[PDB]
Every structure is written in C-alpha cells, then in structure tokens.
C-alpha cells in the first residue's frame, strides 16, 4: 500500500512516500512523468524493499 520513489538526477537526489492501491499504474504514470520532467536513470522493482531507485 506504500511505496518509495528515489530518483537521483546525477546531481539531484530526492525521496518521497505515497500510499496507493495500484503501484503498477502509479509506477508507470510516474515513470513517464519523471522522464518528461527530465528524470532519467535505471529503474527497477524491489519487492524486498518495496522501494524504487533511479540513477542518471
């Protein structure tokens, strides 16, 4: 119900928390949104840490 999104813009780092019931949909929407905002790197789906990380 709770996930984490860590996106490192090479020179920019930020962490946030959100409570949703559809990570599959949110994860996809956030990816396209982050990319559009200039957020790139390596994304993955961690089940043991239910946390996401992106490194430009």
């Amino acid at each position: 119900m709770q996930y984490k999104l860590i996106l490192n813009g090479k020179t920019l780092k930020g962490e946030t928390t959100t409570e949703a019931v559809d990570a599959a949909t949110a994860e996809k929407v956030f990816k396209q949104y982050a990319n559009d905002n200039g957020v790139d790197g390596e994304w993955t789906y961690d089940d043991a840490t239910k946390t996401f990380t992106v490194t430009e």
Side-chain angles (χ1 to χ4, degrees):
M1 242 164 165
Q2 64 185 35
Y3 287 83
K4 226 204 197 293
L5 237 307
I6 286 163
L7 22 67
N8 223 315
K10 242 286 264 182
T11 44
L12 217 309
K13 58 245 287 236
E15 61 241 68
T16 166
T17 81
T18 73
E19 288 90 330
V21 190
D22 40 307
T25 70
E27 286 166 356
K28 209 291 215 207
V29 165
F30 230 109
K31 262 175 268 302
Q32 194 196 164
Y33 211 110
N35 198 141
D36 183 328
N37 243 24
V39 183
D40 283 22
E42 253 64 319
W43 342 252
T44 18
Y45 0 70
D46 295 52
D47 197 8
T49 66
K50 354 175 160 33
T51 207
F52 274 58
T53 85
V54 211
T55 303
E56 177 174 352

